[PDB]
């Protein structure tokens, strides 16, 4: 409302990195940077292996010739392979001439990133996601989507933070950083696993209330202030993450761009949690939105 | 197969086309396809020209060298110019080597597309939009955003459908097709203009209810049916667009897939409007979503 919506990074730099990886009858997406392809290690599994894989043993059994990597029409010859945690690394005969400036970063719950959904190494769609407090993401992922990556771009530098591995029974998604470390208490085995009970990202809700004010949505503002302690007692009651002093400092700018003190805005949110929204919406939403970071609000508004 | 998200097309093919166009102190974006840069003609207005510009009189006073066109840090030499409706076409000395397979299409209200928001010829972010029934879009556009484009990329062809020109007093946006013809009764003049009252895109709400069913949710169905006439008589009391026999025909495939007759889903929507969601959500929304088309739903849930 008044010009504020979920925005993904332009995906071009990542599009030029997606490849298809095939091991026997198992196909998924790979990330091609320089002369290495990164993909989920579960590509080395047949359907039955996935039910209870011995990744050490399945990798000893494989050779370079067991991996087919396709970049558009061109087969890349695999000349080496290794595992790092839950990602397979395939050394190829050819460095990606579209490799962007990049790094691998591991993000914290509450942080947002752009997902390039891919199938058969072909980019399909882009959308914004937040790492939930329970380490899941609310993605849109079908069969063959594994190896799709999540990223942020700063100037010309792509920061890769997510590689897609699996779908939990609630329909939410679990994955790794690009070093193959899982976000959350999940394993790359087709076995009964479940998302923990989710919590709301308090600092992101406050950020979005700041976005509402900057966009002229002020009905929820009030004369009242509060303390972290009273507010955190409300937060806890309503399955909201504790608000930390560090969260307040991060919101500092917006507290000035709007001249409303975080603990002043905390009074609005407490009131909204206690008394609800009263038929009114905020930036077009009837729900309190927690998938915009303070950075995201500034990026989109002040940017 | 439970996750559903507003998903944009991967933007790489359009990113390679975005340039900066400057005339005097006025800078905005251009679309560089082969040896032509397409941009809003209002780049040739000064501060003084905004209320009642005569574009024919402003343009005839310009030389090729008055147009500064920048592709990254490379200056493109303008060797020609013409005006077509509200678009300027700048002939440059260099065909864009990144030109994708493209066409120009004029869309109807209800149609969706991806927007690549740009500033100074630099892509900023990508989001999904729909042409509203009142010929506006609910975009997120700031100063310098004019000449940002809307597109689809069904089947490796980029279809350019929108070029951004202006913001209306309610915060909605107005622009042209790539032939420079405005969507709606708008003019590229800082004259008192206002969006017509807007309506909800009924065929799209129904598509998204079909999406909810495909992804395993049916709580909102009921034992009733409706005539098309009775559906429209109720829906228009909630500011919904009339549903046409064309709309019913368009929903046929989604009807067939789910086993829910179009007019039975219509009966469900009539009850949804009457009752609200009673604390429930549909694909994570507390509101009825109208910016997914029947075609978008088949894209994301299947192909
Ligand atoms: C990668 N190509 C897919 C992506 C999945 C498929 C549908 N939606 C997605 O996001 N990854 C998998 O199929 C992984 C893979 C085996 C099983 N699996 C799952 O995602 C399964 N989920 C789980 O087993 C659970 F619940 F533990 F998360 C499935 C039931 C097929 C959705 C491996 C190795 C974990
Ligand atoms: C292109 N760079 C901008 C994009 C605008 C700026 C703010 N948000 C946007 O979408 N285009 C313009 O500034 C156009 C341009 C003169 C004025 N204008 C407007 O968008 C203005 N609005 C209108 O005149 C109105 F209400 F009629 F739509 C403005 C008040 C600056 C928002 C011209 C030639 C229309």
Numbering used by the authors:
A (entry chain A), B (entry chain B): 0 to 302
From the article:
The main protease from SARS-CoV-2 (Mpro) is responsible for cleavage of the viral polyprotein. PLpro cleaves the viral polyprotein at three sites, while Mpro is responsible for cleaving the polyprotein at eleven distinct sites, including its own N- and C-termini. Mpro self-processing is called maturation, and it is crucial for enzyme dimerization and activity. Here we use C145S Mpro to study the structure and dynamics of N-terminal cleavage in solution.
